[PDB]
Amino acid sequence: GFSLLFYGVGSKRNFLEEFAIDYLSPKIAYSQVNSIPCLILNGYNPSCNYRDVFKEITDLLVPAELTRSETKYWGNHVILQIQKMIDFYKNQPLDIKLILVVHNLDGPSIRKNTFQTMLSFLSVIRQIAIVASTDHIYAPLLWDNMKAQNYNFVFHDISNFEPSTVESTFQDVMKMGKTSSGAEGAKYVLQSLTVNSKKMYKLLIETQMQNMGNLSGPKRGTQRTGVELKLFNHLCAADFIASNEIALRSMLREFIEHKMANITKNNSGMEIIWVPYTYAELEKLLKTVLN
Amino acid sequence: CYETLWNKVSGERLTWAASMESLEFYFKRVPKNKKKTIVVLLDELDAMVTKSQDIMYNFFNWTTYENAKLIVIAVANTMDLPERQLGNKITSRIGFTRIMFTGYTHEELKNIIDLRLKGLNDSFFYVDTK
Amino acid sequence: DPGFGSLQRRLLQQLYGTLPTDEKIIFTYLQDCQQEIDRIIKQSIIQKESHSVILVGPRQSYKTYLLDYELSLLQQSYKEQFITIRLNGFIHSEQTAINGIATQLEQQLQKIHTISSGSLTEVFEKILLLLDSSITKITVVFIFDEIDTFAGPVRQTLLYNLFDMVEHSRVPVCIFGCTTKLNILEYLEKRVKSRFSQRVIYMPQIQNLDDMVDAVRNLLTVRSEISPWVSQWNETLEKELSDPRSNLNRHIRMNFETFRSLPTLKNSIIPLVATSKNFGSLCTAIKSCSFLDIYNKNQLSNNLTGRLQSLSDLELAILISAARVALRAKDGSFNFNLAYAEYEKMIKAINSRINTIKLWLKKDVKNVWENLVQLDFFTEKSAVGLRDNATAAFYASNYQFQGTMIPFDLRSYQMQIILQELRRIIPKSNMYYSWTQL
Amino acid sequence: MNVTTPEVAFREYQTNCLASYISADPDITPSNLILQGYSGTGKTYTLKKYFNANPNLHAVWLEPVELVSWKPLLQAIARTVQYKLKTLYPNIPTTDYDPLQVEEPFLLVKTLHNIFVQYESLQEKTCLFLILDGFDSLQDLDAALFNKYIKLNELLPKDSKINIKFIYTMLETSFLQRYSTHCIPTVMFPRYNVDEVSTILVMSRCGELMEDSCLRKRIIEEQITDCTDDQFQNVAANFIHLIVQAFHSYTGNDIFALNDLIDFKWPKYVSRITKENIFEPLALYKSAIKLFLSTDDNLQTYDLSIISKYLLIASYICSYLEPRYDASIFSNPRYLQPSLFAIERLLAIFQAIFPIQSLMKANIEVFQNLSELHTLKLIATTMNKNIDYLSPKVRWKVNVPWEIIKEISESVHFNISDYFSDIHE
DNA sequence: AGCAAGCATAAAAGATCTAAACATAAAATCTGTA
DNA sequence: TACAGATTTTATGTTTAGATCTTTTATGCTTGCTT
């Protein structure tokens, strides 16, 4: 029942992945046929949200649905459900059902108090093993007595001076960080994509900046400035990018999964595609990779 | 905009999204042998496109379909509203017929007023003094 | 005697204006605009001609009074030839005004002889179908108060539709819109401006003292022989208004200079006639107008001076010390620590110059600080009192202000009464009068 | 007038104005009437006395402080108006309108119209008064709600046999002065004098104090015999007078604070009564001086660790002392808000002031204690909802007064005063 | 070494807003099966 | 085979989490200066 924390200088991503997938999961599976599923959290990604992570956890291990009396008055359906998990797993054999691996737990979006509280409450469960890594030197400042008690860490020092090429992918190195935008990871994805997907993304960006210019620089993209999926289908069909809406949705699944574009339903019932990047970031994407 | 138009062309009362899909099918797919020409006047088009601008695109796009016999007459206060809301590419694709209504001059306005009082100016009346 | 009771009731219902419309009194200074209001309405209910008029005037300028008197006057002789829909911008919303119009149309049409059933789209479509289409047409009269609140900058569809009904409908529609803004025209959008007829009636103002004298004479003269005291009451009122040196004329002149509003004067006078027990007391009260002075003194009994005159020794000392530390500070701000330091310095100096004033501790001065804050002698350094809208108040309630986070001792305050004002108010015989001059 | 004016002790003008405005005739009573005054000014008391003296005036008392927002206020008005109307006229067949259907001011207008149109069977017009005790006391209050409530009476039918007349008892004059152009008739309630407060307190509390159980047991325990009707009343009046003349400066002209003080100090005052001192009030006062010398209105400040205590000490020193540590030390300015600093400076000062073992490094435990200190709000940041402790732009500050940090420093035997005595004592 | 005055400017506090998460509901429409 | 009963579709309402913005005071930098 001890969560493992790995700190040091270098990239511990390879260490954590190899330890969890190649050693931990098969060994737990044999000591308990299928291997224990591993949820690899990429905390260096600035677009890591606890809603999606908890949805993945719920999919991996199915919990009891939160009842009407347990939802409270506008209560957090994630925290209450995790407490329900804790109560359910308190009286049950202490096997291991999930191995969630937290790469770079102090990353730009994974360091926030909400997701840290989520991980703190998940750490109480003894049926999931937690193997986390931290790179920041002030990382222990994140956790008070309650969170450091729920984590129940055993700190291990693994310094290896590794390049950390994957962690540096999501933000520019030449600018020397001059972090949470996530547009650099989007561009890195954009070099390696199908030409049809690149054209569809370029059209979406162009129309979204048209909407933003109609509305008004440093403002992010929301559903207020976004394309309707029917209108986007019409545009793509006019440009031969997508034959039908099914193909367009299939293409958009990759961008939605990578947290690049979001489809959300507004008050009118329309479903709107919007890219959560600012005007300058979209212009840079069009000039650099989408030119 | 849709709930009205479909109700004016089908007699059915549908929701706005169902009406939009019905209009798309009616204009794109129904053969021209089973249709009547439609002349739609979009008075004050400024108010329709203020949040999502999809009314303009939907109503102008339906005039591009070969099967559709729609005729849209759009009225707005700004001469460049489609060029802003739709964009240059979409507006160039649609191919409008653009007309500008300049304000009246003093002579034209005087002629309007005179025609409004053609039979009454310099006329004769019987007035009951009581 | 019942005669004086009848006279007093008649006087009170003359002041309140609830006397029958056959004998309602119209002040001479506003007998002109009424004619205009009398004209337009009589050109819409009798001649069946559409009209769109906006009445601009301050609060209590007799807009609703005249607009209701005219409707009552037209009501008794043309009851079945018009219906009235009343809307108020304060209690009606953009979505809610449609429901209000539909419900009022259905109610008035059943009264003279559904539209209010369905969604907002159906209701609006039905009211457009009914209005914006031997035997004549019923005139629809819109009494539409606070027209400026429905003439916002984001969208004006109700006003647009109403003015389009005025122009392009076969049913005669009269739309009266009351507002206080002098620039109501620039509030409307250009389409609504074009649709509006630019018929703005600016309500008359009291420009003379004789106007208020005549208004008071109209208010307080009983013109119906209902009590034995009516003739003597009229004689007394006329002899108290004829001479310019009388107390009633003096108070009328003071109202003319300061307030210049008949409603304030009648509010002052209503308890004057309701308090009197017999006719002699009423005559003496109208000759001396002592109750007017009492009422005026009471009205000014909770402001800064009245609140300051109701402070204990410790609270007054703390207030003076806070005023001194705010005067010394460049920003006019202070906190509990500085104020208490100045207070204890003052108390030490006073006791040294000497039967000794007690120096209360911090725990015994926190309550005084809270009491002085409650009376709004101090406010937060940068605080918004009350938000204008409900949405702004909701947003403020959601936000957690930094002022409540910091400890009570270090909270930065700022006064409403400066040290010079304290020097002026406080009597020269006070113990702390030497300490109100920094 | 047929309206009887109650004899309120110190509200004669206010009662006269209430009788002048509030009358059973709808023609000669204002649509809106306002009662203004501060806490303890006897406005609800005066209105209750006036309405009790006149059982022929129909009143619907409402308390907006319980109804935090406007929708509960409208729903409660709609419910209570029809409930009261049913109570007065149970023989009128009426249909029930659900108060929860009132969700807009227009919905309230429509519901009130529907309720009033079914009472046309009455012979003469009546008016029921909606008293809103504390319209100023709404928690979710803006400057536009009262504008709605002023003009609410215009849209309701003019010829109805049931007239609604609103009465508001607001608290603050700053709120009332926003609506000064509406010319609403207003009755002001000035705060009481010291003599008025003393008389109110004696006439309101002497009867209860003289019948208290503690006095009942004390008189029989001390074997005393005296005039029960009068001597005990005089004793209670003298106690109230002593309380007032001792704590008037502390409380002010506040009836509630003095009532609380009387409740707190009466048992201790009566526990000091005996045979000799009851007859002479001077001796009884001299035997219980300690009661009237201290207000006593209060009902090792922290159990923090030595690391947490030294972290707080270092944070206070860092925040309230300028970054001139380089010159001499480590080898009032406290009257103002604490300044801001960084984590590294706090850690350096903590290492400097921590007792040697030869120096204390920043373990996991130190950072855990610092994060706990921020959790307990003893140390704050420039946080705005989302907070990231690891951002270089986040700066820290202290949230303890001088007394708390002084107690903490003396707990670990640290002289923070000597450090802070350079600028001022 | 140590510090006052002037300046630009990064920053704190908060107004103003959006929108996702949490929630309710009437009409239409899918779905069983007696 | 029409069905009630379960589900989806459409339409707002309530509340929390997160954003950008203006407005105003703190702040490092520069200039001038003496220990």
Ligand SMILES: Nc1ncnc2c1ncn2[C@@H]1O[C@H](COP(=O)(O)OP(=O)(O)OP(O)(O)=S)[C@@H](O)[C@H]1O
């Ligand atoms: N229907 C009415 N009958 C008699 N007197 C009335 C009537 N309506 C208002 N009054 C009185 O007329 C005086 C002022 O006239 P109002 O019409 O109320 O003011 P106003 O012009 O409506 O100002 P607004 O509407 O608040 S901008 C007050 O003393 C009111 O009590």
Ligand SMILES: Nc1ncnc2c1ncn2[C@@H]1O[C@H](COP(=O)(O)OP(=O)(O)OP(O)(O)=S)[C@@H](O)[C@H]1O
């Ligand atoms: N004139 C008076 N005569 C006798 N007792 C009074 C008098 N005025 C106030 N009191 C008493 O003092 C207290 C005052 O209570 P309230 O009249 O309710 O105060 P208030 O003016 O309503 O202030 P708030 O805003 O309601 S807290 C009650 O216990 C009354 O019994």
Ligand SMILES: [Mg+2]
């Ligand atoms: Mg009015």
Ligand SMILES: [Mg+2]
């Ligand atoms: Mg009260």
